[PDB]
Symmetry: D2
Subunit: 114 residues, 4 copies
């Protein structure tokens, strides 16, 4: 299945936060309605935050996360969870190698804000 | 039901990250086996990160999140989600008032690291 | 927090299924847009299915689950999970006594159908 | 990523339930510790239950779901959710064709029982 794609409510603010856990330098691309709106880059094996931004989901509400290491696409896993019928998390893990820890770049999307 | 309490595997590194979305100044306490090991305080209506740390779950693996505003306990909601049978997220929302957005402090715990 | 309340897309067919794991006879009340549309009743300590129905979410999309045992309200816990940005589960556990297993009646709501 | 594989606690009773939403006849295979312990075969476009059983997770706790239609493997998506630090759901969707509804066979695994 395609992973890392989420439909948000339109024209809504969301937070996006990326964490690194790999020897490889991670590149996280955030696409909103098929246009790049953020790129995060960094390296850590200790969960460093390599980016955190507030973005808007625009008309279509389509948010897509892509992760690459030195231009090679990582394999993604994802899900959305809603708490109290209001608080939303869109969650992405990514795997750059063989150990299947899926934490090499971790991306958390949250909404609503404010 | 009690919320904000999670059993992690023992002696395991995990990340904890807190975001604020409220007029009220948020205090997030992180307890590991009933000892307060991190405290984050801050105010934002725009999802600012008010704390991020790497901790160890210790022998019992018990991680508890408590949130207060001006000394009053916020109401909590929480769940754990596991992706690819390996990547864990323990998620907490909190409500300090009446609107039931549950985002007033948001806490994300992730493991494994590295 | 209020639990057992979910917003579905409008005018959508969904499934609701209840399981029992308790000495007590469970009564599961299902409301769509604040009107009762189903009642499931049954007793099992071995996960028997006590009801399964297909319903429509109507104009408002509001679905609420309440659980009681001999007229006493059970404590509820809930969350919604979305897989592949399409497949929805709304999940309820309930606690009728003191052991905090939250499985006394378990309700699974799924959509889309067909 | 591999999907449909879950680690349960050892020697634990769990429920497995399958629903069908497809023109195609679904075959759901359930393995516990790499041995087939149930096969559900059925057809519905309206969320009928095509199997429900109580099984034991054995020493290894490994539960795997596979879904096929006329011998061809469906694409799987999955996740595990824990409520109240106690109530577990392991969730599977499957896609047998091209519409990406992921509901063609839906499998819900729940524990604890009793
Ligand atoms: O005070 C907690 C509260 O802050 C934010 O809401 C604001 C306050 O209620 C107050 O300043 O009134 C404002 C409207 O005039 C309102 O925006 C929200 O983040 C709310 O969720 C939070 O609980
Ligand atoms: O009574 C509801 C309760 O039922 C099941 O526990 C049982 C009861 O407490 C009573 O029948 O005593 C039995 C032996 O002590 C006990 O198993 C459980 O399903 C429990 O979760 C439920 O709340
Ligand atoms: O065949 C699997 C498919 O079944 C259901 O879609 C139907 C079939 O494509 C076929 O019978 O044509 C029908 C009308 O065109 C169509 O509804 C769906 O459940 C689909 O999700 C599933 O993959
Ligand atoms: O290939 C990079 C590699 O670096 C580290 O060894 C680990 O974090 C692995 O999970 C990661 O995949
Ligand atoms: Ca890895
Ligand atoms: Ca890693
Ligand atoms: Ca609030
Ligand atoms: Ca708020
Ligand atoms: Ca109970
Ligand atoms: Ca019980
Ligand atoms: Ca399909
Ligand atoms: Ca289908």
């Amino acid at each position: 299945a395609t992973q890392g794609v989420f439909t948000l409510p339109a024209n809504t603010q969301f937070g996006v936060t990326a964490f690194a856990n790999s020897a490889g330098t991670q590149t996280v691309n955030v696409q909103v309605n098929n246009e790049t709106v953020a790129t995060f880059t960094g390296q850590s094996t200790n969960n460093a935050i390599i980016g955190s931004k507030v973005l808007n989901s625009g008309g279509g509400g389509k948010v897509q996360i892509l992760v690459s290491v030195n231009g090679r696409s990582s394999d993604l896993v994802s899900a959305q969870v809603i708490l109290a019928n209001e608080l939303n998390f869109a969650l992405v893990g990514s795997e750059d190698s063989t150990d299947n820890d899926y934490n090499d770049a971790v991306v958390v999307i949250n909404w609503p804000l404010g």
